[PDB]
Amino acid sequence: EARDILKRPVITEKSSEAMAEDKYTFDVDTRVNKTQVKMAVEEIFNVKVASVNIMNYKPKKKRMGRYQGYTNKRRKAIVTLKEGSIDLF
Amino acid sequence: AIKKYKPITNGRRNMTSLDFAEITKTTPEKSLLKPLPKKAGRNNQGKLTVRHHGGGHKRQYRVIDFKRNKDGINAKVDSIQYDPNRSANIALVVYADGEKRYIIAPKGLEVGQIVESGAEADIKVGNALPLQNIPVGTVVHNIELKPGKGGQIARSAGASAQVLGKEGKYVLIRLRSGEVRMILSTCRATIGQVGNLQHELVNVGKAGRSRWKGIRPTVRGSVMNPNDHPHGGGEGRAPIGRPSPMSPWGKPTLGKKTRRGKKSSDKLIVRGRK
Amino acid sequence: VKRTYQPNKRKHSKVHGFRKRMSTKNGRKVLARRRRKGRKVLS
RNA sequence: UGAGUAGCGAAAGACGGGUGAGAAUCCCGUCCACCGAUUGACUAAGGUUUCCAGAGGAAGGCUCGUCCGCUCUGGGUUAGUCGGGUCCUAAGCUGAGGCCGACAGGCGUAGGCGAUGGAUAACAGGUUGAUAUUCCUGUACCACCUAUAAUCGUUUUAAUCGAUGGGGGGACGCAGUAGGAUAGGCGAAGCGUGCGAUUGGAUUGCACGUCUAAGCAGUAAGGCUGAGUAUUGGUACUCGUUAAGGCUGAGCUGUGAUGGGGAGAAGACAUUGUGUCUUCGAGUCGUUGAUUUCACACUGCCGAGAAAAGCCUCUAGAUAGAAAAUAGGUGCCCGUACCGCAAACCGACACAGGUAGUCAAGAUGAGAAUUCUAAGGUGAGCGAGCGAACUCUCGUUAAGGAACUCGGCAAAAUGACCCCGUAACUUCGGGAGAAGGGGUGCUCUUUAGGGUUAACGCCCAGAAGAGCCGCAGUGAAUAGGCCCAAGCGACUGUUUAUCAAAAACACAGGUCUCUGCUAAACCGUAAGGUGAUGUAUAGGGGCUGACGCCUGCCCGGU
RNA sequence: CUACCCUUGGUCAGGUUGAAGUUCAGGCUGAAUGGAGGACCGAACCGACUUACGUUGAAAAGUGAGCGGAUGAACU
């Protein structure tokens, strides 16, 4: 369930400047609440989580050659931690 | 009791109102009030079935007891009060055990006077007792038609009826309308006349005052179109143009009787209106 | 000049809209009629 | 085809520099102009990525385009306290059983759902290209859980808790008045700035003088004539009109929160080509006038002005044993970008239209009117010439002054403030701003009330004289033409969205008639409803239409 | 959209007039006080009377200048 709650990390410039602090950004399953996210991070990465914020993103319109559609909707979570650090690249 | 206004304005030129000198308290009793949302003459289908009922002032309902079934206990009168839902004033009484309720207020009622109901009560203004125990000739109000149901006759401001005679289990009585009728002798009634006798002398004065009371205007039938009303118009003004005036629904409306035949109360009506 | 059609999210979902159409027999007729035509949007 | 014709959708731009293949149209600078009870700043609906950065110039943009609300690529919305849900109910909608009905189905009881209302714990500063009461720093508050504990003592009782038990409360209209505070405005100015090159002055020009929730103290007035006893919300007694605060509530003020933050200032940068900031310094006064904010508090009136929960109390009754305090912990879901009186909403359009609420500076004034400005925003997505006829919008005009025309249609004229004067008629209120006259700037004396106030002084002068200037003194803008006599309708109101606003409709008043209550009347096949939680001083229908004086003859016909 | 209604909310710069009532004075009327009204004048706001313009419109009902109501049978 823990490997199914967290989907992948987000690597952008806003997320990197946040990682300058102790904040890490994830894309998570669109059905979970922030308590599940908090407990999943602690189990997978073996750290101590201080807080967690979440937000929802709508689907966007997009084209590929006269084919109008939508992207997937997504859920984003930002995890502040007290002790430890997550190794990424 | 009737105060006249000076003609400072054309609207207030002949207006009249009654001063509220009988009222002794201007705030109702919180425990006996209930909500009363308005219906503008519209039934459970949502359609308008009675004309000319509209949006007046907001009102609360005072719970009045027309039964008077607490017997053998005295009640002392506290105050006379205004009631928006009827033409008579009301009085708040307090029973010896501490209960309060409203009754319609009779003509010569005063604060502090004690009032009583039962079969052994005395013949004095305010008392309620069965018609069997009321001597002939008494003036009486708030009469029942089925024993224990509550008073239904003679409840307007200044209304009264008087007892005439006695049959086996019925009592003769003359109503304010002028008709004489038999009423079951097990039915209660209250002694006296209903107060606020000046109520019908008021001159309303302006169109807006009757709109404050929930009355919307009335359009005459002869200024409508033929598809709207039997008096639907011709060219210019026109006479009635028929053997008899009609209603908006095409039925004669001047002189024709509408009481239904074969009613059970036919045998109780001794003499009708004249 | 005020035009007809002043939009409103709640009014639209309550007058048209799936549950309202399903609450009567003649609304279920509409839904079946649009299914038979192959229409992409039902209410 | 009409034809290189009509149009290019309200308005002020000019020049220098830059970039580019290409510039009236893009970027930067200076000057000029327009709005400013708003073309400024917030919040809703509605829209749904239009938001930001880099790249682009085929189509869209009424011209151009290097630009863009357009195309490509990649990004952006963070909540225990903000608005909803895990709270409450209104209208209304649904409704287990139930009632009715060719079928389909209609109604309705308990109960549910349903805000536009009731309840409800967070503020100041910092920071990004794009979010912030959400992130960061500081300081708080509210629920819930477990430990550490004084008080806890049969669990009747006792502390405790306690009812689908009782009582209170929440809890309410409209108008007016006199106040208390505070916000904001204005003038001296306690410390900052700089001191002029066109004649002159320097006692002179310009400005700032801030700062939260929470916590502690006290407190301007407000309400209750208050405060005990015995008995069944009520009845008898004592101190009473004291209000002393006895009690209850109550705006606001002082401390600290904060030797902190920010700050008119640079005066400290090696630098962040010196910009920006490493860094180090600093002021928090007294006057005046004062709400449209903070009480339906108080007084008055008739048309007599929601509910339920949260909340406070007394209980039947129950149980070790529950109290505050300290220390730890825990705190979900949805929305959050951007436009938003509009180039993004409703109008087919980058459309002179329509779109709920909040904030509201200076001079002048009664004013949110008028003209010019502030804070802030904007220069309108075709231009350059020439100054033809004709059309539109605007100004002036000799002599005459309605001769025009269906008709003074349109225009002109009146207009603010102060003083004087005011008819017929009348329902005695009115008519009335009737008509008709006169005055107004600036300076100096004398007086001189409100006396601003300690006071002439603060300030309108409260007023009288004596002077000066012009064609003209409410020198601009804005601000009633009036009178006489007849129809019609008493009056305020209403009407043919989009050719008729009226003499038409309403109306207060009058009169006739039906209706004794499961009322008559009306909707419905019925059940069920309105009438009405009303009861002849009431309810339905017809005609007339304030008020005054009145309302004649005919009952053969229907 | 529009007509009527139901429940629950919101808005109306300023000036003017001076009803009941009350208090004194005179001898029933005079002065103070008071603050009524489908009252008056006039912005916001709501309307739509006259006129000019527009009529392959800026707009499939508008704009400019005057104009009616503006505490109420008000507007939203």
Author numbering:
A (entry chain R): 2 to 90
B (entry chain C): 2 to 275
C (entry chain 2): 2 to 44
What do the study authors state?
The ribosome, a macromolecular complex assembly consisting of ribosomal RNA (rRNA) and ribosomal proteins (rProteins), translates genetic information efficiently and accurately into proteins in all living cells. The large ribosomal subunit rRNA helix 68 (H68) is a key element in the protein synthesis process, as it coordinates the coupled movements of the actors involved in translocation, including the tRNAs and L1 stalk. During translocation, the L1 stalk shifts from its so-called open state to its closed state to assist the release of the E-site tRNA from the ribosome. These L1 movements are coordinated by rRNA H68 (3),, whose sequence near its base is highly conserved in bacteria.
Aiming to identify such rearrangements and following our hypothesis, we have conducted a thorough cryo-electron microscopy (cryo-EM) structural study of Staphylococcus aureus ribosomes that were incubated for various time durations (i.e., 0, 30, and 50 min) at 37°C. Single-particle cryo-EM techniques were applied to identify ribosome flexible regions at 37°C. For that purpose, structures of the S. aureus large ribosomal subunit (SA50S) and of the whole ribosome (SA70S) were determined after incubation at physiological temperature for various time durations. The nominal resolutions of the SA50S subunit structures were 2.65, 2.48, and 2.73 Å for 0, 30, and 50 min incubation time, respectively (SA50S_0, SA50S_30, and SA50S_50), whereas those of the SA70S ribosomes were 3.11 and 2.86 Å for 30 and 50 min, respectively (SA70S_30, SA70S_50). Nevertheless, H68 was clearly visible; thus, this helix could be modeled in all five EM maps. One class accounts for 79% (144,826 particles) of the particles used for the three-dimensional refinement with H68 in the original position, and the other one accounts for 21% (38,658 particles) of the particles, with H68 already showing the rearranged conformation. After 50 min incubation, both 50S and 70S show two classes with rearranged conformation of H68. These data suggest that the rearrangement happens faster when the small ribosomal subunit is missing.
